[PDB]
Every structure is written in structure tokens, then in C-alpha cells.
Amino acid sequence: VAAVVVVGSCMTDLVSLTSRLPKTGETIHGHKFFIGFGGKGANQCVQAARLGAMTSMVCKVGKDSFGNDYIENLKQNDISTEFTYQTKDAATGTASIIVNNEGQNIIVIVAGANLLLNTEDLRAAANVISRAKVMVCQLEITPATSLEALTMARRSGVKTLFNPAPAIADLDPQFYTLSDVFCCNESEAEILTGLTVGSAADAGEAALVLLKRGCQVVIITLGAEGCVVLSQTEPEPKHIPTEKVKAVDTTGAGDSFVGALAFYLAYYPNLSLEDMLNRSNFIAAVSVQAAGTQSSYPYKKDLPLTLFLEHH
Amino acid sequence: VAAVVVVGSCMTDLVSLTSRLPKTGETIHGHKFFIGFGGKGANQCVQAARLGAMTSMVCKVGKDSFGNDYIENLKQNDISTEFTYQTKDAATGTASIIVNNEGQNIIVIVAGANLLLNTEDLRAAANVISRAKVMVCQLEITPATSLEALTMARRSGVKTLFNPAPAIADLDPQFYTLSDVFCCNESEAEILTGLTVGSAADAGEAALVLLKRGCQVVIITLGAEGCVVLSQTEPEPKHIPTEKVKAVDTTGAGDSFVGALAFYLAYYPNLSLEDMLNRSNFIAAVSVQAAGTQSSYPYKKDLPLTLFLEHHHHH
Ligand SMILES: [K+]
Ligand code: NA
Structure with a gap:
């Protein structure tokens, strides 16, 4: 029985490494190409699964080589693919990524x-969703499909974790009211609220705007400064700091954080929110210490046992 | 027995269509993505094969999904893959292409x-090369490997067709002396000679510089204006114009021209050069009338019969 169900995106990353980023009109040579596995949904699901969660990924890929490889990737991470659909009508989602030496990049996404x-694809996952502990969604699929998933989770009493990413200025108000936990980064909060968010102080103001739109719990992540959290029961913004790490590659770190959070909502429901966010920050910080996205996500066996212990 | 042997590149084109080209730090959404088969070597080989040539493609691709697809592509076009090596040590060659609405693009090539x-890969192909009629090379693989292929073709009396593309300023002088036919476009001739090439008249000047570096025959293609040719035996530049066509997509047209030329050098060696070029220009023009590079290259069955005739010689 899957405790964590993720309804979201799978993307094949087609990555070229170069010394400079090309300008309009330019043909350059890079020195390495490789294929990686991405997509916010799948990323979050993979991190949750590597923590030991039983997960199920509801998504749709193409009936093509990239899609068959994606399915294999999910299976290699012990994620159930019972509701991973394939379709002839479009290709698997792709992200074309060029990265220079500085680590800067240009990205073209075709969903x-x-x-x-x-x-209909979600309806078929109804039994699975009704038995889960947590439903996770983002904004990389059709927004109506994510809404319906959250609506189904609510109806069955399943906790909803919503990550509004990539963020859009004009977001449907139901996303807030259907979210038990609403988690985003500074950059996304700036888009959703129109406010500046550089510091913890700023974030607390933005989180309150979101809380008043109807979320139960709002979390704004602040990269190296940790995160701020507010809830209906505890509306005072609370800052949760993170011990400074050495960052190799921060790609996918937000997804590592959300996946860890899904894991804790599902298997450690009695931990305090602050304690879950401390542990999730730690896990994400491990991921920033290695290159890659999914390949940098740590397994339970490689993490300290205190992250998996809970007192009475 | 392969009459045309191509020693060159196979490249997977990964194409994203967008409305704007992205800048540093930017993620944008495009509206379509697709995969195409490219690489100058393979393109040339595919055109030659669709004209009826027995070809063999000496190249190396990855032991990955793209490489298996490429090998399947070559077989689907009836090209011998005996010396299409696969290696687990690098990925298949890739060109990542982003194209905006204005038609401008950003291209990243990882060979x-x-x-x-x-x-050593060529030495294993030695018998195949010694039995061919034509050896075709470009500049998308290690230049030393192309040189050694041309040297092996020369030793066995095999005719060498060399397409210096993409062009480099400092080209090893042996490429000229090892080339029986040296074929490039205006743009490449500018790089190799350092001259400006904006007309047929200019192209004749640049061709003479190349001829004087040691080529036997020099051909500079001029897109819609056809081509200019000169040789050791006929050094006066000769402009060979072609029928005007309405161009849908010119991508891969130069490769269609070289592949046709290889086909004629191999199977119609007694046609005059001018005649081979007239026919090759026509074939390349057909390719520009459809989209999609290799999928635009015409098959023999779809081309006029007179392209495959020779006065008093059956084919
Ligand atoms: K990482
Ligand atoms: Na074409």
C-alpha cells in the first residue's frame, strides 16, 4: 500500500556541458552530453522513495523511447508505476539544458x-489515492488535473501537499483552499504575492498573505537560511534555520526538500512541524553536495539514523 | 560489395521550437520537441544509398538508445553497418537545437x-575500403582519422571525395593533396582561403587558390545559383547553374549534393564532371522541396529516369 502518491510530471533532461553559453545565432561545441531524469513530480517521488516510502507515481509519458526509459527509472527506484500512462499523441516531456563551467544555464522545457x-487517468487511481497518507502535486501538469487530484485526496481524508512550482501570478484560488501544506520558495512566493522576499522577515509577511488565501500550513523555503512556517493554529511566522553546508550543485534541492517532507507527513505524522522541516532541510542539504538531480538524492541507508527516530 | 564507403559522423538532432531564444539563467517553454537523424557523414551516405548505391558507413555511435536508433536508421536505408561501431565510453553525437519564430537558432554540438x-577502427575496415569505388570524408570526426581514411583510399586506388565541413582556418595541407574531388560551399571556401566569396566570379577565384594548394578537382556550391567547378585539366572556372525551385527547407541540401556526387563517381565514372554536377544539383534541389533533412532525400524510384541513363551504357 503506497503511503505517498505523487500526481505530477516526468521530464527527460537532455543536458549539454559547455564552456560558454551560446548567444542568438551561434553554434558552439560542448564537451559532454548526457540524459538525466527530472520533472518536479518524479523528483519528489524519487526522494520520498529513497527515504523508504512506498510511493506511486501518477503521470503520463510518451509511447516512445524516452518514456520507456522513464518507466524503467521509476521502477529502479522502487516506485509503483501502476498509474504511469503512455500516449502516442505526444512525446515524453523534455528539458533541454545547456550548462557552462560557471554552472549557469539555459533551459527549454517542452511539457x-x-x-x-x-x-479519467486520475479516476482510475481512486483506490490508490484513498488508501494513501499524502498526495503531492505541483504545477507542471494541466492545472485542472492537479486540482482534481487534490479534490480527490480531500474527499478521502488524505493529506495534501502542494508545491506551486513553477509559480504563476494568477493562480486559481482553489489551490490554497485545497492545500493542507502549501510549500514554495522565496522566488515563487514573490510571484504569487507580488511582494519582495529576501529575508526571513520578508517571508513571514508573504506567508501570511498566503495563509489568509486559505492554506492550512504555509512553508516558504529560504535556501541556505532554512525556512519560515505558519499555520492556522500557529499563525506567528516561525523561522527554522539550517547549519551552513558546502554547495556543489543546488539543482533539484527544492524537490528533495518536498519529497522529504512528503515522507515525514506520511510516516512520522506526530513529529512537530519544526522537526519535520529540520530533517527535510538536512536531507535537501545532502542533495546539494552532489551533482545531478535524482542521482544526488540520498538513500536512507546513507543518512544518519537520527533522521528516522522519533520519541514517544 | 559496397561501392561507396563513407567515413564520418552520425549525430542525433534534438530540436526544440520556441517563440523566443532564452538568455543566461532563463527557463523558457517551447511548444514542440522532436528528434531527427543527422551528421554529415550519415546524411551523405543516406542520399547515396537512396539513389541505389551499395554503401557502407564507417562511424562510431554510443551504446545507448540514440545509437541503437541510429543503427536501425542506417539499416532502414539499406546501408551496411558492419563498421558502425558502438562504444559504451561516450554518448552518441548530439546537436541540441533551439529555434525561435523568426527562424533564428542556438545550436550546441557535442561530437x-x-x-x-x-x-584501429579503420584498419579493421580495410578490406571494405580497398574494394570500394569512392571514399567520402568530412571534418566532423577526428581530423587524423579522416586523413588516414583518405590515405588508405589513395593506396588502394579508390577515388577520394572530401567535403571540408565544418571548415577550419588552419586545415592540414595533406587534405588537399589526398583529395581527388574537393567539394565545399561559399561559406567554407571563405574560411579555408581567407577570401571573400559573394558571387560565382569570386567563387572561381577561391577555387583557384584551392586548386593551387593541390586538389585535382575543386567544386564550390552556391546554393540556388548551382556551383562552380575547376580542375587540373580545365582550370578555367565553370559555373553550372540549376533550375530554380521554391525552397521549403534547405537543411541537409549540401549533404544531398555530396551524396549524389558520390553515387555518380561510383557508378557512372565516365560521365563528364559537368554532367555529374548537373544531375547532383537537381537531386539536391529536390531535397529542398521538403522538410526534415534525411526524410527529404529523394529515392531513385521518385526521380526522372534520365538521371540514371548514360549514352550507350546500361545501368
Ligand atoms: K544536487
Ligand atoms: Na529538405
């Missing part, structure tokens, strides 16, 4: 088959 | 497994 996961 | 085709 493809991700945009065709529909309400 | 990959193509750069690992070495002289």
Missing part, C-alpha cells in the same frame, strides 16, 4: 505528454 | 562517440 494526464 | 573513431 509534452505531461499535459495530457487527465481526469 | 561524443564520433571523436573516438580511430585508426
Whole structure:
């Protein structure tokens, strides 16, 4: 029985490493190409699974080589693919990424088959969703499909974790009211609220705007400064700091954080929110110490045992 | 027995269509992505094969999904893959292409497994090369590997067709002396000669510089204006114009021209050069009338019969 269900995106990353980023009109040579596995949904699901969660990934890929490889990737991480759909009508989602030596990049995203996961595809996952502890969604699929997933989780009493990413200025108000935990980064809070968010102080103001739109719990992540959290029961913003790490590659760190959070909501429901966020920050910080996205996400066996212990 | 042997590159084109080109730090959404088969070597080989040539493609791709697809592509076009090596040590060559609405683009080429085709890989192909009629090379693999292929073709009396593309300013002088036919576009001739080439008249000047570096025959293609040719035996530049066509997509047209030329050098060696070029220009023009590079290259069955005739010689 899957405790964590993720309804979201799978993306094939097509990565070229270069010394400079090309300008308009330019043909350059890079020195390495490789294929990686990405997509916010799948990323979050993978981190949760590597922590030991039983997870199920509801998504749609193409009936093509990239899609068959994605399915294999999910299976290699012990994620159930019972509701991973394939379609001839579009290609697997792709992110074309060029990265220079400085680590800066340009990214072209074609969502493809991700945009065709529909309400019928979710209905078929209804038993699975009703038995889960947590439902996770983002904004990389059709927004109506994510809404319907959250609506189903609410109806069955399943906790909803919503990560509004990438953020849009005009977000449907139901996303807030259907979210038990609403988690985003500074950058995304700036878009959703129109406010500046550089510091913990700023974040507390933005989180309150979001809380008043109807979320139960709001979490704004602040990168190296940890995160701020507010809830209906504890509306005072609370800052949760993180011990400074050495960062190799921060790609996918937000997804590592949300996946860890899903894991703790599902298997350690009686931990305090502050304690879950401390542990999730730690795990994310491990991921920033290695390159890659999914390949940098730590397994339970490689993490300290105190992250998996809980007092009475 | 392969009459046309191509020693060169296979490249997977990963194309994203967008409305704007992204800048540093930017993520944008495009509206379509697709995969195409490219690489100058393979393109040339595919055109030659669709004209009826028995070809063999000496190249190296990765032991990955793209490489298996490429090998399947070559077989689907009836090209011998005996010396299409696969290596677990690098990925198949890739060109990542982003294209905006204005039609402008950003291209990132990682040559990959193509750069690992070495002289030992060619020495294993030695029998195949010695039995061919034409050896075709470009500059998308390690230049030393192309040189050694041309040297091996010369020793066995095999005709050498060399396409210096992409062009480099400091090209090893042996490429000229090892080339029976040296074929490039205006743009490449500018790089190799350092001259300006904006007309047929200018192209004749640049061709003479190249001829004087040691080529037997020099051909500079001029897109819609056809081509200019000169040789050791006929050094006066000759402009060979072609029928005007309405161009849908010119991508891969130069490769269609070289592949056609290889086909004619191999199977119609007694046609005059001018005649081969007239036919090759026509074939390349057909390719520009459809989209999609290799999928635009015409098959013999779809081309006029007179392209495959020779006065008093059956084919
Ligand atoms: K990382
Ligand atoms: Na074409």
C-alpha cells in the first residue's frame, strides 16, 4: 500500500556541458552530453522513495523511447508505476539544458505528454489515492488535473501537499483552499504575492498573505537560511534555520526538500512541524553536495539514523 | 560489395521550437520537441544509398538508445553497418537545437562517440575500403582519422571525395593533396582561403587558390545559383547553374549534393564532371522541396529516369 502518491510530471533532461553559453545565432561545441531524469513530480517521488516510502507515481509519458526509459527509472527506484500512462499523441516531456563551467544555464522545457494526464487517468487511481497518507502535486501538469487530484485526496481524508512550482501570478484560488501544506520558495512566493522576499522577515509577511488565501500550513523555503512556517493554529511566522553546508550543485534541492517532507507527513505524522522541516532541510542539504538531480538524492541507508527516530 | 564507403559522423538532432531564444539563467517553454537523424557523414551516405548505391558507413555511435536508433536508421536505408561501431565510453553525437519564430537558432554540438573513431577502427575496415569505388570524408570526426581514411583510399586506388565541413582556418595541407574531388560551399571556401566569396566570379577565384594548394578537382556550391567547378585539366572556372525551385527547407541540401556526387563517381565514372554536377544539383534541389533533412532525400524510384541513363551504357 503506497503511503505517498505523487500526481505530477516526468521530464527527460537532455543536458549539454559547455564552456560558454551560446548567444542568438551561434553554434558552439560542448564537451559532454548526457540524459538525466527530472520533472518536479518524479523528483519528489524519487526522494520520498529513497527515504523508504512506498510511493506511486501518477503521470503520463510518451509511447516512445524516452518514456520507456522513464518507466524503467521509476521502477529502479522502487516506485509503483501502476498509474504511469503512455500516449502516442505526444512525446515524453523534455528539458533541454545547456550548462557552462560557471554552472549557469539555459533551459527549454517542452511539457509534452505531461499535459495530457487527465481526469479519467486520475479516476482510475481512486483506490490508490484513498488508501494513501499524502498526495503531492505541483504545477507542471494541466492545472485542472492537479486540482482534481487534490479534490480527490480531500474527499478521502488524505493529506495534501502542494508545491506551486513553477509559480504563476494568477493562480486559481482553489489551490490554497485545497492545500493542507502549501510549500514554495522565496522566488515563487514573490510571484504569487507580488511582494519582495529576501529575508526571513520578508517571508513571514508573504506567508501570511498566503495563509489568509486559505492554506492550512504555509512553508516558504529560504535556501541556505532554512525556512519560515505558519499555520492556522500557529499563525506567528516561525523561522527554522539550517547549519551552513558546502554547495556543489543546488539543482533539484527544492524537490528533495518536498519529497522529504512528503515522507515525514506520511510516516512520522506526530513529529512537530519544526522537526519535520529540520530533517527535510538536512536531507535537501545532502542533495546539494552532489551533482545531478535524482542521482544526488540520498538513500536512507546513507543518512544518519537520527533522521528516522522519533520519541514517544 | 559496397561501392561507396563513407567515413564520418552520425549525430542525433534534438530540436526544440520556441517563440523566443532564452538568455543566461532563463527557463523558457517551447511548444514542440522532436528528434531527427543527422551528421554529415550519415546524411551523405543516406542520399547515396537512396539513389541505389551499395554503401557502407564507417562511424562510431554510443551504446545507448540514440545509437541503437541510429543503427536501425542506417539499416532502414539499406546501408551496411558492419563498421558502425558502438562504444559504451561516450554518448552518441548530439546537436541540441533551439529555434525561435523568426527562424533564428542556438545550436550546441557535442561530437561524443564520433571523436573516438580511430585508426584501429579503420584498419579493421580495410578490406571494405580497398574494394570500394569512392571514399567520402568530412571534418566532423577526428581530423587524423579522416586523413588516414583518405590515405588508405589513395593506396588502394579508390577515388577520394572530401567535403571540408565544418571548415577550419588552419586545415592540414595533406587534405588537399589526398583529395581527388574537393567539394565545399561559399561559406567554407571563405574560411579555408581567407577570401571573400559573394558571387560565382569570386567563387572561381577561391577555387583557384584551392586548386593551387593541390586538389585535382575543386567544386564550390552556391546554393540556388548551382556551383562552380575547376580542375587540373580545365582550370578555367565553370559555373553550372540549376533550375530554380521554391525552397521549403534547405537543411541537409549540401549533404544531398555530396551524396549524389558520390553515387555518380561510383557508378557512372565516365560521365563528364559537368554532367555529374548537373544531375547532383537537381537531386539536391529536390531535397529542398521538403522538410526534415534525411526524410527529404529523394529515392531513385521518385526521380526522372534520365538521371540514371548514360549514352550507350546500361545501368
Ligand atoms: K544536487
Ligand atoms: Na529538405
